[PDB]
């Protein structure tokens, strides 16, 4: 019907910022029903509000290696999908 | 054959470099039985030979928005599994 639950895997950034991602992801899913837009949406918001550059990813399942900045990284599993975010300009 | 067929979708880098990724992904997959290790392996190899910084992802299904450099970007589905590679230091 609408299964969904947060499950932070790891995060290194201000609570409000990481929490923002949680809502940014939740709302992102509500608007977009495909990881492509979900990630791209979240990225723009963080890149525009928190200043560039943010890299975003979303998927039901996937592994990846990535390098980011500092105090600007977060990753959490929501429902049947994962939402990754971190600056790596 | 045993499936594991490459399927280039996006590419923006030296032929040998992109082809290297194809083999790097193919070999990476046969080495590790988890897309997570795949990216980490492929990434280190490119950051080692090509020099940092490379972002690599591998998953059964997902989507992500990311900005890279130039002449250092590539993406392709291998054996159904997605395998992304691109510099975005």
């Amino acid at each position: 019907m609408c299964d969904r639950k947060a499950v932070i895997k790891n995060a290194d950034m201000s609570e409000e910022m990481q929490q923002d991602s949680v809502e940014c992801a939740t709302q992102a899913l509500e608007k977009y029903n495909i990881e492509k837009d979900i990630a791209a949406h979240i990225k723009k918001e963080f890149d525009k509000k928190y200043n560039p550059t943010w890299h975003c990813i979303v998927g039901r399942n996937f592994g990846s290696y990535v390098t980011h900045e500092t105090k600007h990284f977060i990753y959490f599993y929501l429902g049947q999908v994962a939402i990754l975010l971190f600056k790596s300009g | 054959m045993c499936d594991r067929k490459a399927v280039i979708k996006n590419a923006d880098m030296s032929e040998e470099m992109q082809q290297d990724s194809v083999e790097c992904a193919t070999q990476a997959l046969e080495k590790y039985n988890i897309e997570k290790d795949i990216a980490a392996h492929i990434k280190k190899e490119f950051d080692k030979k090509y020099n940092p910084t490379w972002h690599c992802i591998v998953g059964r299904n997902f989507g992500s928005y990311v900005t890279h450099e130039t002449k250092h970007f590539i993406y392709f589905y291998l054996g159904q599994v997605a395998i992304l590679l691109f510099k975005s230091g």
């Binding site: 990813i57 039901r60 990846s64 990535v66 900045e69 500092t70 990753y75 971190f86 | -």
Partner: peptide, 9 residues
């Protein structure tokens, strides 16, 4: 503002 880190669902 620079550090590598793995990630997986």
């Amino acid at each position: 503002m620079s550090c590598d880190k793995s990630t997986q669902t």
